[PDB]
Amino acid sequence: KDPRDVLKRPVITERSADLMTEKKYTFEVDVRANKTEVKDAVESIFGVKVDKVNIMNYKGKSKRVGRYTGMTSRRRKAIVKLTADSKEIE
Amino acid sequence: MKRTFQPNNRKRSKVHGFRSRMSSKNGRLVLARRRRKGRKVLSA
Amino acid sequence: AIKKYKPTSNGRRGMTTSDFAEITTDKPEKSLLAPLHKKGGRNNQGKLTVRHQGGGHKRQYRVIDFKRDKDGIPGRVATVEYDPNRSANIALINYADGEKRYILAPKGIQVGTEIMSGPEADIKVGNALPLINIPVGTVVHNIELKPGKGGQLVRSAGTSAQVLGKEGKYVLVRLNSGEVRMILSACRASIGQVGNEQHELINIGKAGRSRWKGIRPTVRGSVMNPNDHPHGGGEGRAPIGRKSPMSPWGKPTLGFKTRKKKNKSDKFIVRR
RNA sequence: UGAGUAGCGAAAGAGGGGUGAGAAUCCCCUCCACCGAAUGCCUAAGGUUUCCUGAGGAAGGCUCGUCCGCUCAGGGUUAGUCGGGACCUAAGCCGAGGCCGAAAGGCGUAGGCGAUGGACAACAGGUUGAUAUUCCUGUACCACCUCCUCACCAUUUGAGCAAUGGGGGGACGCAGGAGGAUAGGGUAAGCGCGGUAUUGGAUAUCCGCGUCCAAGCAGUUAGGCUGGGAAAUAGGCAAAUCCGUUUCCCAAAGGCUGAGCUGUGAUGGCGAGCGCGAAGUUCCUGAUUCCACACUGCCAAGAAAAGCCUCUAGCGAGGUGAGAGGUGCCCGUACCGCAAACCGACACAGGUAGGCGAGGAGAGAAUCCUAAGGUGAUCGAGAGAACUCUCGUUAAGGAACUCGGCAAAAUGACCCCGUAACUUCGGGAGAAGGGGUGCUCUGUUAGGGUGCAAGCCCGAGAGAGCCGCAGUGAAUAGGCCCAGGCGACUGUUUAGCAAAAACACAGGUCUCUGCGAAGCCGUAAGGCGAAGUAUAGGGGCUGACGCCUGCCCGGUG
RNA sequence: UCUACCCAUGUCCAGGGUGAAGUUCAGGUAACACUGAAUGGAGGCCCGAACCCACGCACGUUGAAAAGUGCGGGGAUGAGGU
């Protein structure tokens, strides 16, 4: 399990932009990953000390276009609080 | 009017579940003929 | 030890109970309890095979020593206890070595007396001997058939049997109901009379009390329907027009013997 | 077609502004009205995005709709401590070997699964539109780990560790009544802030509002439960210092538990009120909650296992204690949850397990009006005919209608007084049926509780007087009596026509069964009967209690 | 998953009456019976909310509802409801 595949994408929202100021970041991570290797991955790949990680996952929202009634993909969101005096991220 | 149906996911799965069907002999035929018919929702 | 409730409500109109002076304690010894969940007349596959049963007050089993195997160790008895499994009452007797045991409390037993169980024990109330040592014409209880199996034959409240004589490998003993039997001479019985002699005279007043004891209602065959009992049916209250009265499953049920006539034990029963 | 007819699904809105093409229906404001042991506040099963923001109004909405539980685009659920997992077991299920069976398979030992139970460490303030014991703030606690620190023991006459093995515990029922304490309430006194009015009067014992704070840490306690020591050891599969059983000696100490109360936790927060922020005490009342199944009584005699303590068997050269520094995973977490999101085909007068559930009068969670809080209920307005339905009064008579007092009317609360025939002596009995009930003074009545007092609260009585036709001035809480069949009684039944004289019943009787009981399910293994033993189980019949239960065995069994 | 029965384990029942059995006191007796108070708190006990049931009437009967609503009723510490 390479760390680079654990973190899929970030999320850009009003609340994400909020948490950026107080040094809490948001990441879409692998569904199977747990609270530990996400921490280890962010540490390894950004070289930044981290304080705490909180994980929460959404169900797949149902949607309808035209005549078809599929289901959106499931999501597992991650919140990472970085320690004080640490480097930021792009 | 406590009507004839009362939903309970635990019991629904425990009786009509795929495990419960696969366990017994007759459930295997039930799944077999459902698959033969080609039903989408194979088991409860 | 039988008292009457003065009729205050209508339920207690006819009522008797047994005050528990014969009992000496209320809390049992934790060690000898065992779990017991009431089956309620249901077989292993779940079907019902015993009518008129189920739904009593929950009870905990106390393992009784029916074998009396431990021989020669002087036993002291200090309790008489209530036990809701069988009519009789039991006694927790503690031995010299230091392990305790339960025993059917016999009539005339009191806290503090001694107990012996060897094949040379003195003959008093509470002692147990192999029948060969027992002398003729002495009341006895808690008899068994196969030696070492433990007493089976006289165990309910106030029940007793009398030894009518020894004649060889077996012995002649008069069980309750008087049907004298031939029994092996190497079996161990308990001398005396079972000590709850007044249990018969109870007058259960309420239906609810029988239900507490765990006896379901019994419906007559007559008021059934034709398909569900050989008596059911008929307009009005009908007499049973089926020659012999019959059981729910077809057999007659008045005055005819039922024990498979070829069985081996019969040759010992027939002493009579 | 019926036909622009029935229906538009219990209910109070009124008005002024706003938006808008269009407004009874959407938004804001002011009154008014409804629930308030709920129509309130949390939380299950369950629903699965319906939750929030911004847009739209074809369809859904029994009307309209600019509106939303509809459509479209975005957004939203953060846990070492909450619930469930890596902890335990009940019923039941599965089941290696096996037992049985034409085949499939049935049964079941070892063993495992299985909460609705047991054990188990975080709480009170803040915060946005959606989350919050999860995010932030201050204080904590739990399990484990050591690059580290100090205090100590011995590195075999071994320090330390402790078992998937014993033993103790966990460990249990129902009802009743004391006591102790606390939620909670009263605003009684005091305190702080604001106000003194225009309708006749009120700087006055005048009006409105508020009047507190954990978990943890250290003490203390109402209390409850406990006797303690010494020697021995036919037992607890092996051990024994543990447990148990004996014998000798002292008799209150010591021990375990303990709601709560004290300080700190609080130099902080919250706090009426215009980002700041006053006072923040005492008194009175007081539990459906806790001490606590603690005590008493009763019989119907009231789970298991692991967590935990302890005993050795055993391991043992490095460990113990405390600091300091760290680690702590998975799933749930949005929203409705007495409702328009659940179950009833519906935005349906139905049903939906738990916790909290205030004030005035009161015994009360009843009754009526109200608090926090929520709601005005999805078709309207205007005529005020019949007829139908739900209600309110009716002169005189009063059950004359009627199959039948069906329905309706009448009594109803509390305190005094008297209560019959019969009776199984309990009952019958709230029998019947009479009297009083308001308000003021004598009174901060005797007297009682509370407290050192001050004060607060409870209030038997009488004696004077004052009112109205009417004093439990409303809401709501027995109609009664005499006889008789049937059934002793409480209870149960034809969900969805029939709740009864039918069923059951305790009691009685007959009969079967000597225990691999009989009887019953199954073919059989297996069971129930029963870890029960003729004072017990099965079956037939009758049905409290009192007096009794006659003759016939020719026939059928 | 409705319903009948049963097993395991939890949970609910505002408030007020009656007053059993025993027990203490006093008398009573040689002693025992017994008599009167006090205490006591039992009942498939009584009245009555939640809860459950469904006896009467009316309405409804192409209903709000494929069995209900409104006003009265029965049980309400038990064979209880859930």
Numbering used by the authors:
A (entry chain s): 2 to 91
B (entry chain 2): 1 to 44
C (entry chain Z): 2 to 273
The authors write:
In B. subtilis, the related protein MutS2 was recently implicated in ribosome rescue. Here we show that MutS2 is recruited to collisions by its SMR and KOW domains, and we reveal the interaction of these domains with collided ribosomes by cryo-EM. However, unlike SmrB, which cleaves mRNA in E. coli, we see no evidence that MutS2 mediates mRNA cleavage or promotes ribosome rescue by tmRNA.
A tenfold excess of MutS2 protein was added to the disomes and the reaction was incubated in the presence of AMP-PNP. We observe two major classes of collided disomes: one with only mRNA density in the interribosomal space and another with an additional density next to the mRNA (B and EV3). The latter class also contains additional density next to uS10 on both the stalled and the collided ribosomes. By local refinement of the experimental data and rigid body-fitting of a model of MutS2 generated in Alphafold2, we identified these extra densities as the SMR and KOW domains, respectively. On the stalled ribosome, the SMR domain interacts with uS11 and uS7, as does SmrB; on the collided ribosome, the SMR domain is positioned next to uS3. The two KOW domains bind to ribosome protein uS10 in a manner that is highly similar to the KOW domain of NusG, an E. coli protein involved in transcription-translation coupling. The KOW domain on the stalled ribosome is part of the second MutS2 in the homodimer whose other domains are not resolved. In contrast, in the Cerullo structure, the collided ribosome appears in a rotated (or hybrid) conformation. In addition, there are differences in the ribosome proteins present at the disome interface: bS21 is missing in the stalled ribosome in our structure where it was previously observed, and uS2 is clearly present on both the stalled and collided ribosomes in our structure, although it was previously missing from the stalled ribosome.
